[PDB]
Symmetry: C3
Subunit: 247 residues, 3 copies
């Protein structure tokens, strides 16, 4: 009654939530007339995650009573993983303290996930003076991070006007992944000035694990600045990570 | 005591035996002129299995004189798993005490499986006074059992005149799988009174583990009564489970 | 150790070939000449000899200034090569430095630096042995037969007669026989001077065939109580050969 939210393609929704539970244990979901929003940090406070799902991506969106619900992400994910690619997903909140999760397909399957109280910090998604913007295929990003992990625990990002390089170096071994606009993997490159920063590979691997090979990923960063990594859900939804630099 | 039994498609035969070995360790196979039959209980005596493979599903069927052979089901399954989807399977017994198992395909591969003797019991499949019958797609049944296992160790079956519900509840968590004749998953429903029973998920999971997503499964049960579960092999073969209810 | 540049179209195919050899050896010396690349090594137990020959004809670019031998950690080479994609171009390059540059050119340019190691080389000959039986069979049949036999025994008997090839394993109570004739799809050729019988350790056989393709044409040559020679061809021109001691 307080809200009813319907998404066509339950497995696609599960995959989106799964990306976020890779860094997050618990999260507050704010459900308004405009859409669903979520913002949280990983337990080490190194990564900020911001999820925005406008009502335009839902087949039915009815919010009688706007509110904020607390969800254990591991439990949520476990239930959503039961959804099939052709299932319709329904999120329903009654008067009681649980979220009703229904998969409608060859049958009607209804789970009750008890809501929890999550201590919500005031988290701001700041505007940052990024000097480099990179749009690249998820496949390239995911492979670069895997390549770098054979070598080191950190990955250097280097943007110049004509080339984007991700470089990792160990005691003896080294890997360099280089993209120019001549390469199929680089879809856009915008570089206000030469930009160099480094990031922990363990965090990057968790950020990209759920991203699809065909997905388009936007990176923004600055010298010794955080990395902002965005990808879009059904064109209008957006998943954003902000990753503290490595020093 | 010679016989020769030939089945087109070794992997399909492997799959069928694999379903049965999920609960059975050893089995007497009765080999007669009309077909092959097998009947056994799991080690806890909670589930009875009945397998009937009429002569009509075999491409060649030559039985000198009816006889019963005892087979270690795990060993049998291990050999049968070596068969390929396009292999012809030949089951042959000479006068010696082993089963000759041949896969004929890109090569001729012959295994020798020693026969054992099996404690054969007062095992019959009585006709119980079932009050509900449900025919449903395997994938609905398999998914409901996986869903319920997230929540509890027992699954309640509830049949009314136009709805079949499988429900499980934990301390706070609950799931309900509902089917009506409007649903693609429900192929038939016949309910002569409101019927309610519960069954152990661990046994149900082992029973359906081998069933195929598009197999048509028939369920019969009564209130506080065993569950009968069967599905057909090549239309004429039949695999039947009878499962004790849970208190 | 002069510079060279060697280019192979299809990085994943190259990785798979290297992976097959890495199943048995840990370190290998690669001889790079103007004619091609060759590698010969033994497994740590000295039961299996491996011989890899990759002529220049299978490489899309092949620039070698002077012949040289480089030592390579096969596990670290395989782990890098496993990052190549099926449509990547693979570039193996050496400069003046003592490392190998491994580049995948595809949707991006990915360059790894592999330290070269010192590999003390044994006096390894690929002897011309008087094999009395030759079998050409599909990799699918050979791989299945080794798996089948492993259900039963630790050794696999090879029996070649004029008209049939049999692989046979026996356990305490259990037994498997895999039989092929020229009427069979799995058998492409059979040439037998005299009836030939030998047996080989399945653990080695499994390691030898693990990387072989189900459609590859594998040639077997053996003799009674003699080693087994197993080879298959790469781009019809390169060749990977195993020589496996028999079980006695």
């Amino acid at each position: 009654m307080p809200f009813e939210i319907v998404f066509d393609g339950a497995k696609e929704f599960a995959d989106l939530i799964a990306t976020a539970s890779n860094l997050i244990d618990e999260a507050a979901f704010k459900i308004t007339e405009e859409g669903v929003s979520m913002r949280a940090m990983d337990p080490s406070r190194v990564v900020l995650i911001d999820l925005n799902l406008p009502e335009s991506i839902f087949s039915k969106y009815e919010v009688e009573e706007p509110e904020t619900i607390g969800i254990n992400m591991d439990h949520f994910k476990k239930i959503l993983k039961r959804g099939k690619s052709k299932d319709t997903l329904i999120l329903r909140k009654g008067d009681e303290n649980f979220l009703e999760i229904t998969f409608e397909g060859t049958a009607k399957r209804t789970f009750r996930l008890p809501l929890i109280d999550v201590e919500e910090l005031e988290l701001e998604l700041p505007e940052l003076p990024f000097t480099a913007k990179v749009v690249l295929l998820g496949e390239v990003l995911k492979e670069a991070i895997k390549d770098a992990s054979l070598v080191s625990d950190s990955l250097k990002f280097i943007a110049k006007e004509d080339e984007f390089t991700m470089k990792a170096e160990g005691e003896t071994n080294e890997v360099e992944i280089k993209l120019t606009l001549e390469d199929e993997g680089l879809l856009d490159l915008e570089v206000e000035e030469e930009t160099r920063s480094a990031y922990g590979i363990s965090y990057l691997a968790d950020m990209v694990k759920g991203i699809g090979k065909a997905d388009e990923v936007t990176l923004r960063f600055g010298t010794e600045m955080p990395l902002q990594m965005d990808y879009f859900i059904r064109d209008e939804g957006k998943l954003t990570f902000l990753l503290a630099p490595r020093v």
